[PDB]
Amino acid sequence: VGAGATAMDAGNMIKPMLARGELRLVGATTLDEYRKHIEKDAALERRFQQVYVGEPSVEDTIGILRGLKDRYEVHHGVRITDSALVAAATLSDRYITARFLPDKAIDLVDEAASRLRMEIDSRPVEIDEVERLVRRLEIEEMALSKEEDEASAERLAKLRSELADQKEKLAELTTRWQNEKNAIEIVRDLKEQLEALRGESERAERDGDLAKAAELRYGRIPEVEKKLDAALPQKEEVGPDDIADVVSAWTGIPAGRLLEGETAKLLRMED
Amino acid sequence: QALQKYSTDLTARAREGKLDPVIGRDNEIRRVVQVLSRRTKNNPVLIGEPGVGKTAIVEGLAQRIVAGDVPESLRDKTIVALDLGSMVAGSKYRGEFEERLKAVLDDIKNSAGQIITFIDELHTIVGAGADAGNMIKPMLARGELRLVGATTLDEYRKHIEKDAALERRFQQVYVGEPSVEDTIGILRGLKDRYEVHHGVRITDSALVAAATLSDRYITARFLPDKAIDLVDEAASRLRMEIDSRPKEEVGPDDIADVVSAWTGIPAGRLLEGETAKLLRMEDELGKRVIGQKAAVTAVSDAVRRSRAGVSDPNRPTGAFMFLGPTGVGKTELAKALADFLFDDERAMVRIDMSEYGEKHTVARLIGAPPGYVGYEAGGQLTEAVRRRPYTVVLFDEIEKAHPDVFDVLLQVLDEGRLTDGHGRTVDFRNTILILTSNLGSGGSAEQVLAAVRATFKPEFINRLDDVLIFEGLNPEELVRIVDIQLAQLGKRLAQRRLQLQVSLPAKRWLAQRGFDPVYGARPLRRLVQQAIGDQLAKMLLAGQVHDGDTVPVNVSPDADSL
Amino acid sequence: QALQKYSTDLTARAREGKLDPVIGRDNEIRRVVQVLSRRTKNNPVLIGEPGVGKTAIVEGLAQRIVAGDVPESLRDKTIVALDLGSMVRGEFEERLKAVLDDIKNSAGQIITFIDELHTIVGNMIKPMLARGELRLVGATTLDEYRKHIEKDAALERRFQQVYVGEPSVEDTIGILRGLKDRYEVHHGVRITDSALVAAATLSDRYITARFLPDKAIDLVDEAASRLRMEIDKEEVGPDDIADVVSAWTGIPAGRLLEGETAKLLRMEDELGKRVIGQKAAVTAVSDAVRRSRAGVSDPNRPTGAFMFLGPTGVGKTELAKALADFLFDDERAMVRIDMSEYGEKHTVARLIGAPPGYVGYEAGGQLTEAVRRRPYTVVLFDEIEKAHPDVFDVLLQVLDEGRLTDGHGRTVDFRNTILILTSNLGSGGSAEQVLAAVRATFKPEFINRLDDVLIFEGLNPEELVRIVDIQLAQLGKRLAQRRLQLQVSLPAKRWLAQRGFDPVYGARPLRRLVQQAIGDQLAKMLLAGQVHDGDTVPVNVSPDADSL
Amino acid sequence: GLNPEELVRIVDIQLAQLGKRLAQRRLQLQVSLPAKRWLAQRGFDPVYGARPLRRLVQQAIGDQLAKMLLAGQVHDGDTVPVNVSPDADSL
Ligand SMILES: Nc1ncnc2c1ncn2[C@@H]1O[C@H](COP(=O)(O)OP(=O)(O)OP(O)(O)=S)[C@@H](O)[C@H]1O
Ligand SMILES: Nc1ncnc2c1ncn2[C@@H]1O[C@H](COP(=O)(O)OP(=O)(O)OP(O)(O)=S)[C@@H](O)[C@H]1O
Ligand SMILES: Nc1ncnc2c1ncn2[C@@H]1O[C@H](COP(=O)(O)OP(=O)(O)OP(O)(O)=S)[C@@H](O)[C@H]1O
Ligand SMILES: Nc1ncnc2c1ncn2[C@@H]1O[C@H](COP(=O)(O)OP(=O)(O)O)[C@@H](O)[C@H]1O
Numbered sequence A: 001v002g003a004g005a006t007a008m009d010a011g012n013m014i015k016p017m018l019a020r021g022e023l024r025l026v027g028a029t030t031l032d033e034y035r036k037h038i039e040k041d042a043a044l045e046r047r048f049q050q051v052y053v054g055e056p057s058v059e060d061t062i063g064i065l066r067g068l069k070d071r072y073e074v075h076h077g078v079r080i081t082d083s084a085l086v087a088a089a090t091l092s093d094r095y096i097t098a099r100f101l102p103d104k105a106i107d108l109v110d111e112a113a114s115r116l117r118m119e120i121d122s123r124p125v126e127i128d129e130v131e132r133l134v135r136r137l138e139i140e141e142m143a144l145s146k147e148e149d150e151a152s153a154e155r156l157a158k159l160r161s162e163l164a165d166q167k168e169k170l171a172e173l174t175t176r177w178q179n180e181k182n183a184i185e186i187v188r189d190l191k192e193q194l195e196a197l198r199g200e201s202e203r204a205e206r207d208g209d210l211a212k213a214a215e216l217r218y219g220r221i222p223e224v225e226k227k228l229d230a231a232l233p234q235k236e237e238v239g240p241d242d243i244a245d246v247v248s249a250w251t252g253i254p255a256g257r258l259l260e261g262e263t264a265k266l267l268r269m270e271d
Numbered sequence B: 001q002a003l004q005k006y007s008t009d010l011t012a013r014a015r016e017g018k019l020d021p022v023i024g025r026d027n028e029i030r031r032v033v034q035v036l037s038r039r040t041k042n043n044p045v046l047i048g049e050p051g052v053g054k055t056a057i058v059e060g061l062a063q064r065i066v067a068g069d070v071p072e073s074l075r076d077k078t079i080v081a082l083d084l085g086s087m088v089a090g091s092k093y094r095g096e097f098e099e100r101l102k103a104v105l106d107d108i109k110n111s112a113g114q115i116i117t118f119i120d121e122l123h124t125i126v127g128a129g130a131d132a133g134n135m136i137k138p139m140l141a142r143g144e145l146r147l148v149g150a151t152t153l154d155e156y157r158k159h160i161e162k163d164a165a166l167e168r169r170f171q172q173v174y175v176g177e178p179s180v181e182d183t184i185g186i187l188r189g190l191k192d193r194y195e196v197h198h199g200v201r202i203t204d205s206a207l208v209a210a211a212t213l214s215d216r217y218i219t220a221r222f223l224p225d226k227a228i229d230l231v232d233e234a235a236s237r238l239r240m241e242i243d244s245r246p247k248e249e250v251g252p253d254d255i256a257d258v259v260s261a262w263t264g265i266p267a268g269r270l271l272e273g274e275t276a277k278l279l280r281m282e283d284e285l286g287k288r289v290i291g292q293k294a295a296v297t298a299v300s301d302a303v304r305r306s307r308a309g310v311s312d313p314n315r316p317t318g319a320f321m322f323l324g325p326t327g328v329g330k331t332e333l334a335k336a337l338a339d340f341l342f343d344d345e346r347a348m349v350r351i352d353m354s355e356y357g358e359k360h361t362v363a364r365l366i367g368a369p370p371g372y373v374g375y376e377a378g379g380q381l382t383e384a385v386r387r388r389p390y391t392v393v394l395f396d397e398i399e400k401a402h403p404d405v406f407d408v409l410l411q412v413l414d415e416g417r418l419t420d421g422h423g424r425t426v427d428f429r430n431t432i433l434i435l436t437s438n439l440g441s442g443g444s445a446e447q448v449l450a451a452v453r454a455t456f457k458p459e460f461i462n463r464l465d466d467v468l469i470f471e472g473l474n475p476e477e478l479v480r481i482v483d484i485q486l487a488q489l490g491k492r493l494a495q496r497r498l499q500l501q502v503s504l505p506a507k508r509w510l511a512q513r514g515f516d517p518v519y520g521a522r523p524l525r526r527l528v529q530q531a532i533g534d535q536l537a538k539m540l541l542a543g544q545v546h547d548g549d550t551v552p553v554n555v556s557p558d559a560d561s562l
Numbered sequence C: 001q002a003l004q005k006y007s008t009d010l011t012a013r014a015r016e017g018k019l020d021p022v023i024g025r026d027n028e029i030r031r032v033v034q035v036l037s038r039r040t041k042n043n044p045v046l047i048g049e050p051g052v053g054k055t056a057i058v059e060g061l062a063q064r065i066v067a068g069d070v071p072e073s074l075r076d077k078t079i080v081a082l083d084l085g086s087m088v089r090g091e092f093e094e095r096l097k098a099v100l101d102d103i104k105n106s107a108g109q110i111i112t113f114i115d116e117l118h119t120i121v122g123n124m125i126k127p128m129l130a131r132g133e134l135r136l137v138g139a140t141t142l143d144e145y146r147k148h149i150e151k152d153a154a155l156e157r158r159f160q161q162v163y164v165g166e167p168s169v170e171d172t173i174g175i176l177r178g179l180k181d182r183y184e185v186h187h188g189v190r191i192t193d194s195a196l197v198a199a200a201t202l203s204d205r206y207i208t209a210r211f212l213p214d215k216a217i218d219l220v221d222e223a224a225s226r227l228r229m230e231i232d233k234e235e236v237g238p239d240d241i242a243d244v245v246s247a248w249t250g251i252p253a254g255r256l257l258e259g260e261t262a263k264l265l266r267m268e269d270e271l272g273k274r275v276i277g278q279k280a281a282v283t284a285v286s287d288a289v290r291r292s293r294a295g296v297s298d299p300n301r302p303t304g305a306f307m308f309l310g311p312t313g314v315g316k317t318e319l320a321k322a323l324a325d326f327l328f329d330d331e332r333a334m335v336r337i338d339m340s341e342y343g344e345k346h347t348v349a350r351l352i353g354a355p356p357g358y359v360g361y362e363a364g365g366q367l368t369e370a371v372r373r374r375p376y377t378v379v380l381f382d383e384i385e386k387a388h389p390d391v392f393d394v395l396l397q398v399l400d401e402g403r404l405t406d407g408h409g410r411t412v413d414f415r416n417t418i419l420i421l422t423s424n425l426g427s428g429g430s431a432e433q434v435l436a437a438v439r440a441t442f443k444p445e446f447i448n449r450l451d452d453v454l455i456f457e458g459l460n461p462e463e464l465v466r467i468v469d470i471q472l473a474q475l476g477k478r479l480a481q482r483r484l485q486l487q488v489s490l491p492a493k494r495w496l497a498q499r500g501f502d503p504v505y506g507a508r509p510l511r512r513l514v515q516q517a518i519g520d521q522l523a524k525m526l527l528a529g530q531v532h533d534g535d536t537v538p539v540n541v542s543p544d545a546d547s548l
Numbered sequence D: 001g002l003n004p005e006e007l008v009r010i011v012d013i014q015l016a017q018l019g020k021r022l023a024q025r026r027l028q029l030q031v032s033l034p035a036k037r038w039l040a041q042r043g044f045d046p047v048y049g050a051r052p053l054r055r056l057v058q059q060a061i062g063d064q065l066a067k068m069l070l071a072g073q074v075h076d077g078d079t080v081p082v083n084v085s086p087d088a089d090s091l
Helices: A015-019 A034-045 A058-068 A071-075 A082-094 A101-119 A128-145 A153-182 A186-206 A210-229 A242-249 A263-268 B010-015 B026-036 B056-067 B097-110 B153-159 B180-197 B204-216 B223-242 B254-261 B274-279 B282-286 B293-308 B330-342 B360-365 B380-386 B445-455 B478-492 B504-512 B522-540 C026-035 C054-067 C092-106 C142-148 C169-178 C181-186 C193-206 C212-229 C239-249 C279-292 C316-328 C346-351 C391-398 C434-441 C465-475 C490-500 C512-522 D007-025 D033-041 D051-069
Strands: B007-009 B044-047 B080-082 B117-119 B149-151 B171-174 B350-352 B394-396 B433-435 B499-501 B550-552 C044-047 C138-140 C160-163 C335-338 C378-382 C403-405 C411-413 C418-420 D029-031 D080-084
Touching: A058 A082, A058 A101, A071 A101, A082 A101, A082 A242, A101 A242, A101 B026, A128 A153, A128 B026, A128 B180, A186 A210, B007 B010, B010 B056, B026 B044, B026 B056, B026 B171, B044 B153, B180 B204, B180 B223, B204 B223, B204 B254, B223 B254, B223 C026, B274 B293, B282 B293, B282 B330, B293 B330, B293 D051, B330 B394, B360 B380, B478 B499, B478 B504, B478 B522, B504 B522, B522 C279, C026 C044, C026 C054, C026 C160, C044 C054, C044 C142, C054 C138, C138 C142, C169 C193, C169 C212, C181 C212, C193 C212, C193 C239, C212 C239, C279 C316, C316 C378, C316 C418, C346 C391, C391 C403, C465 C490, C465 C512, C490 C512, D007 D029, D007 D033, D007 D051, D029 D033, D033 D051, D033 D080, D051 D080
Parallel strands: B044 B149, B044 B171, B080 B117, B350 B394, B394 B433, B499 B550, C044 C138, C044 C160, C335 C378, C378 C418, D029 D080
Antiparallel strands: B007 B080, C403 C411
16 A cells, blocks of 8 residues: 555556456455555455455364475474374364464474474483473582571571482483383384394295294284283374473463373362 | 674673573573474564563573574574664665665575574564564564564553464463572572672572562562662662771661662561660550550550561551540540651541442542543552552541441451552552541440441451450549640740740649540640630730740639630 | 764863862762662663752762762763754654764763753663663653653663752752852852842742742842943842842832731731721731731631621622732632532532542532642632531531542642631621521531621711722723823712612622713713813713713 | 361461461470460350451460560570460460
């Protein structure tokens, strides 16, 4: 509208060419400004046809995501599960009641993938924060100790307790992480072994070794597969709960899955 | 040479060590990073009430980048402090700000995605128009520039949320204020900077006392800087006391000295002299109120508890309601109290409940709702108490206002809360509410303690403290009452040099006439006036009296004479 | 030093002494140098009325600098002023950029100084300021600062206020007597402490527009210059300044003297110059006002609470109009509020206006909003007998404690006002039943706190000639545009009495009755001829009416 | 409403609050079961709920504690034990 002014002279030089259809001029503008700037100038608005674009539903947002679930999966070196897509397309409509559907859904998936890639970095979350906190309490107890005062006696006696009882949890989280990191050698090593068993069944059938054919098909190979299954799990691709963690960190409504840290608190709420 | 005269380098500034050592807030830095590392629409905006450290997070991110503690795709990005005050400033022509903005954008997008940008107070981005701060909107929603921002709640809502199609390209990071423990941590972290600036020393007890007082007495600003300002103020005052004046470190009571030097609250640890005055209270208050030994002890004990350190910090400093016969000294006791702990009789806030016999007249002490005549003016009582948060509220003769005004005090008491028109909140936590009455009128203590019950409600009588009953005027002590009145009169006779020689029989006849059993000592000041002041006025402008003469009085058989 | 053409220095010219020493106000300097020595929220701002010494304090600090007494942190740091009326649409921001860049590349702590910066603040100095390289010391007034630095600022978090209200009489006297020799060589006449103190007190009391430290110097220098020009008396004195104050305000040098004895002794016919007869009432009221300001009555009471009633048209109001004229120097001061609409129970809230948010709130009450401004009025109360017996409670509260409460929440003060409760009771009784009716109708104890309750004595059938005579002396001024004089004749003048009294509204019509007659009966002669500006215009009493 | 058996725990809670508020001046109390049950025995008049108990705690402990505290002899640190008497309770 106001291309160059000083008294209207510019911005309507294309008003003559529009009518004869010389130029085609496809354009897209928001809805609460088409009646704030253009509609005020109904001499020019007349040359425009409107194509109302309604917001899609969850069923179509799921499809949009399923199609777009490659660019992010590539830009970040991670993988994405379809459960994440569905859970995002549902929670983004249930909770974030301020924006519209095709976008507030994609944002959750994108942030989840970004966080996951940031965790394949040196250390995962919930341990880096504890070690930073331990270093803080250390640098604090070191400089509060040299207090030629008396009011610092009972104030420092608890800081030692807190430092020790957070360092304990640091060491425990460290040990559990080392366990879970050393667990992905066997489960997979067996396969490194299970693949060897598949080569063995190949060669059993090469040599006419029927006796080994089934011993590998119904014995060794499936037995190794069953060994991996052993106990059903109670971190290389996003899941339908990192979405919940993002929707909890933003619009601080808590919507996780009660990750065993507080279910005792809920069952204790009365007392 | 485009973003060289419209921008500095915050990263190089942090490399030169000239920034402050942020302490804590790892959650928000991690959130800002995992937002700034997205694929499209990567622009976080730090939101939160003003003063809580919305820039400190950005300096923290800069320091972390310089130190090298960030993920793989965030190293060596050199965040830039952009500014628009020096782009829209000098331009008087058509299309001149556009060339500068386009030069800046072009210089950004020529280099690779390693010029992460930072506009502070970006509520100054919607103007510049006359089609400005709007051409910059295609680049935003494609991940070309990063544009870390920082804006207050109010300015955000007022300036951006009116432009929805632009607010979409942003992400909010609610930076809530920290608690007392985190504040103590931050203060202990920053201690050394001030300890070096001012050549003094600062004690950890002083830091703790600052972080605790700045939360209980200044309830209009926010913590992470509301606390630091006190430490700075006290360090500066100690420096000035050291210099220019021919046991050199701040203490945990200098902070109380500051936080009492403004806001008027006497918060402290009972420095000397003050304790002598408090111990010497019942008698020091007796020189203005004779009798009522039961009441003075109660108010004195209230003040004693409140200032000694044993009293619920969230409830008023007392909510007494004393009532009794007419003309006994209730309002006068309240005024004498206010004169005791202020030495300013006109520094209390008395409201006359005798006016509020009408229902709707309550609006004077509350305000009016949004959309009505007097809205931006506020409420009388709330305005008077929002400043001077140490007064002595009074409710003269609260028996007239029909039983609806009793439903505002009902929650003024027991919490010290009140909400005016604008939706604000005020604190009555360190005032002394006092509300007289005249129930009874002759009846015994068990005939007036029925009037109280049948007039008010249980939910009300349960709120306020002891219901003091006032005795009747003893027929003897009126001599001392007349003594007080003559002392006040002599004090009025000080511009001249007159004195009085009041005789004992004159004083006796005075205390004898004008104390009728139904109205107490009320018809005494007017009698003193009409029997001394006017008689002297007719006797001074017409000679025969001059300043210096120790005027005596007589007990002539008729009305009193000189 | 590249663009130092919109900036003046304070330490350079201090190295010569072209400034004035600022003895006094040594607290403010310490406060300022303390604020400027912090780490955050430095660079204070001086807040006070105009011509109070804002520039005086900063110059005193500059001189203490050039001498050297402050902490060595602030030592060896100069100051530079700025004038904004030289910068000012556009290019003001360009020159702002130039000067700010100059300060920035100066690479030091060269303090600035920006007078009345409420025209500057905007967003161009905050990125410069929240970095710690420049130090600006500004100044403005209180309400103005409350305007430009509170609504559109968001910057008040980096500005520290400093208050300088006003010096007192004793202080500006010291200021004057310090700043005396400079003029004794500029003109050079002589100076007297009597003249100095007279200037101070008289300016403070009567020049109620400007303020003290510059107001006193203005008058002193003006009188000195006038007495140097007069040689076209080698000293200045109290009269030598009272003459100037009289020439300035309009009030002559006479009344500008002792205001107790020579005033309370003027309660004589100076009233009777406007009122006629009723000398008893004038004497009673004069005694009441004399004894009231003695200095022994209680400090919370109206300056007078008397009432007068009886026959109308005798000049009941005229007494009050002359009374306010003599005391408060104006007859457009009394405020008449009729007690007629106040015959209903609810309408008593009209003269206050109770709630915020109801019909009458912004207009305020009839009584208070006309008293809280001009707290020197003389309130009148017509037909006090018809007012409902609830306003009398308000009146009680007035004349039992000199304060009242409006609806806005304010407190109005009544300790130096005068109440007057007119009426019309006593139509049949002379002095016997009028007092009984006044006792019975009103509450007989409310009357006790009143002063004398005098009744105006009727007009003598002879003593209408005096009122009509003042009337004629007045109307003689009417046709001063053509200098046509007028005639007098006892038959004609007394002819007005028996035909203009009409004893139900005194001499209400006695102005119009005669003015329309004489004026519009001669107005045709004044266009045809028959008169010129020496003619007595002899008007006579024709057989029936007043022709010429 | 409340039962006299339920006010004992309320007394415990009020005393915990008062001790936590006193820990700012590094004091604490040692209350004997005589006084602990005496206070609840003064939780009378089952019409005003449980606020009378709070005003009682104030009137019976806080005034005397302040009176001692600002008159020396109770210098910061050492704890004071409260012990019941025939009618009131002394420190
Ligand atoms: N976590 C923190 N670590 C160190 N200093 C902090 C921290 N939080 C706040 N501060 C200090 O507290 C003050 C806060 O100032 P800023 O955060 O710069 O103001 P702001 O947060 O931008 O608020 P506005 O909107 O600009 S008024 C500064 O002195 C900071 O150094
Ligand atoms: N013990 C006392 N000491 C000093 N003055 C007293 C005492 N008892 C009464 N008076 C005087 O009695 C007069 C009335 O006191 P007020 O307190 O103002 O009346 P009041 O208590 O408000 O009674 P009501 O119900 O409001 S009329 C004042 O002049 C007091 O000085
Ligand atoms: N304590 C003082 N010592 C010496 N001179 C003073 C003192 N106070 C005031 N003055 C003189 O009174 C004059 C006051 O004028 P200004 O300094 O312009 O006033 P201001 O404080 O700047 O406020 P404005 O702008 O005039 S309303 C100065 O010229 C001083 O010479
Ligand atoms: N005593 C008087 N002295 C001078 N003028 C008087 C006197 N009595 C009456 N008047 C004249 O009467 C006019 C109107 O009388 P006024 O007092 O206004 O009426 P009312 O007394 O009924 O209120 C005055 O303007 C004045 O001209």
